[PDB]
């Protein structure tokens, strides 16, 4: 049994933009592990923004090769490596080698019973309010919006969406891009415009305010979830949590944080990170049953892994073994 990394780009189709900054490319880094015929492989997203780097990750996935060598499992995994895009890598590839070995699907491990597709949000980038409506406009037929926004003039941009798209459930995603002087107003104005979600209004420690305002609008952490451990802390500010498998630092860990967050009564959304089917394919299966499901990273990209999972529309179907699990 022997482990590589490998780092991939691919091309975004066009540019992904939130009010952190764009995206032209994504690069990915896999984990693959192969046990004679047998070959488990995961993917993860290297992130800036939580101080990971392409070369870091590839530098702890790597050194895990002789303890991966000598028989390492998913759940000593998840005390010799800390949560991040390392551990997911890592994660995803045992979970699928697990799979192909033992001839018993992820999914039915994970969910006592076959996955089923779901609808997937479609991200519109932050641009223009003209782009960003005619975007919109083309797409006014999904289910699921989700808007990227966060400066401190949105107002011609929330409008201008949600007139392209009267009957879309839409959410928006400031990225820690609103403050405590323009929040209030915002939140108005998502209610006044139907929004059905915010993720991250306020910047990650900096965020007290939303424990003393009405939330006429449910509102999500993002950036500010770290583990489950601090998902109670929670509480007082957000009504909803993303989980990220790139942020848990794989499957094992996002269906632990899944678990606790529904007891503490959080409203669920499973995200992504700009990344590939191989990627979305363990995210569908934390995102069975979840009030929302965002996974639309290969439908941002230029080109998928083939074979890939199959969008029609916004429904996304569960991997098949061919990709992963
Ligand atoms: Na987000």
Same mark, same amino acid.
């Given at each position: 049994?022997?482990?590589?990394?490998?780092?991939?780009?691919?091309?975004?189709?066009?540019?992904?933009?939130?009010?952190?900054?764009?995206?032209?490319?994504?690069?990915?880094?896999?984990? !693959?592990?192969?046990?004679?015929?047998? !070959?488990?492989?995961?993917?993860?997203?290297?992130?800036?923004?939580?101080?990971?780097?392409?070369?870091?990750?590839?530098?702890?996935?790597?050194?895990?090769?002789?303890?991966?060598?000598?028989?390492?499992?998913?759940?000593?995994?998840?005390?010799?490596?800390?949560?991040?895009?390392?551990?997911?890598?890592?994660?995803?590839?045992?979970?699928?080698?697990?799979?192909?070995?033992?001839?018993?699907?992820?999914? *039915?491990?994970?969910? &006592?019973?076959?996955?089923?597709?779901?609808?997937?949000?479609?991200?519109?980038?932050?641009?223009?309010?003209?782009?960003?409506?005619?975007?919109?406009?083309?797409?006014?037929?999904?289910?699921?919006?989700?808007?990227?926004?966060? !400066?401190?003039?949105?107002?011609?941009?929330?409008?201008?969406?949600?007139?392209?798209?009267?009957?879309?459930?839409?959410?928006?995603?400031?990225?820690?891009?609103?403050?405590?002087?323009?929040?209030?107003?915002?939140?108005?104005?998502?209610?006044?415009?139907?929004?059905?979600?915010?993720?991250?209004?306020?910047?990650?420690?900096?965020?007290?305010?939303?424990?003393?305002?009405?939330?006429?609008?449910?509102?999500?952490?993002?950036?500010?979830?770290?583990?489950?451990?601090?998902?109670?802390?929670?509480?007082?500010?957000?009504?909803?949590?993303?989980?990220?498998?790139?942020?848990?630092?794989?499957?094992?860990?996002?269906?632990?944080?899944?678990?606790?967050?529904?007891?503490?009564?959080?409203?669920?959304?499973?995200?992504?990170?700009? &990344? !590939?089917?191989?990627?979305?394919?363990?995210?569908?299966?934390?995102?069975?049953?979840?009030?929302?499901?965002?996974?639309?990273?290969?439908?941002?990209?230029? *080109?998928?892994?083939?074979?890939?999972?199959?969008?029609?529309?916004?429904?996304?179907?569960?991997?098949?073994?061919?990709?992963?699990?």
């Amino acid at each position: 049994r022997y482990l590589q990394a490998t780092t991939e780009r691919f091309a975004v189709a066009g540019s992904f933009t939130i009010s952190r900054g764009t995206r032209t490319h994504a690069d990915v880094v896999t984990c !693959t592990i192969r046990d004679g015929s047998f !070959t488990g492989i995961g993917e993860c997203v290297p992130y800036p923004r939580y101080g990971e780097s392409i070369e870091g990750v590839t530098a702890d996935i790597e050194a895990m090769a002789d303890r991966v060598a000598a028989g390492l499992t998913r759940q000593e995994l998840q005390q010799v490596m800390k949560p991040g895009a390392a551990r997911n890598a890592v994660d995803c590839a045992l979970w699928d080698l697990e799979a192909k070995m033992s001839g018993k699907r992820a999914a *039915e491990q994970v969910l &006592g019973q076959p996955a089923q597709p779901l609808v997937t949000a479609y991200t519109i980038s932050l641009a223009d309010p003209d782009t960003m409506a005619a975007k919109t406009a083309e797409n006014a037929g999904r289910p699921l919006l989700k808007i990227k926004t966060g !400066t401190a003039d949105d107002e011609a941009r929330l409008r201008a969406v949600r007139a392209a798209a009267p009957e879309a459930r839409i959410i928006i995603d400031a990225n820690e891009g609103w403050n405590d002087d323009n929040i209030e107003y915002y939140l108005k104005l998502a209610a006044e415009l139907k929004i059905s979600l915010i993720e991250q209004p306020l910047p990650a420690g900096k965020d007290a305010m939303l424990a003393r305002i009405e939330h006429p609008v449910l509102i999500c952490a993002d950036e500010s979830v770290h583990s489950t451990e601090d998902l109670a802390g929670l509480r007082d500010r957000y009504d909803a949590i993303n989980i990220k498998l790139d942020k848990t630092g794989g499957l094992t860990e996002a269906l632990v944080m899944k678990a606790e967050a529904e007891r503490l009564g959080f409203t669920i959304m499973v995200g992504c990170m700009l &990344g !590939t089917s191989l990627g979305m394919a363990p995210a569908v299966l934390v995102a069975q049953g979840t009030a929302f499901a965002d996974l639309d990273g290969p439908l941002l990209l230029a *080109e998928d892994r083939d074979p890939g999972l199959v969008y029609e529309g916004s429904l996304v179907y569960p991997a098949r073994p061919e990709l992963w699990g």
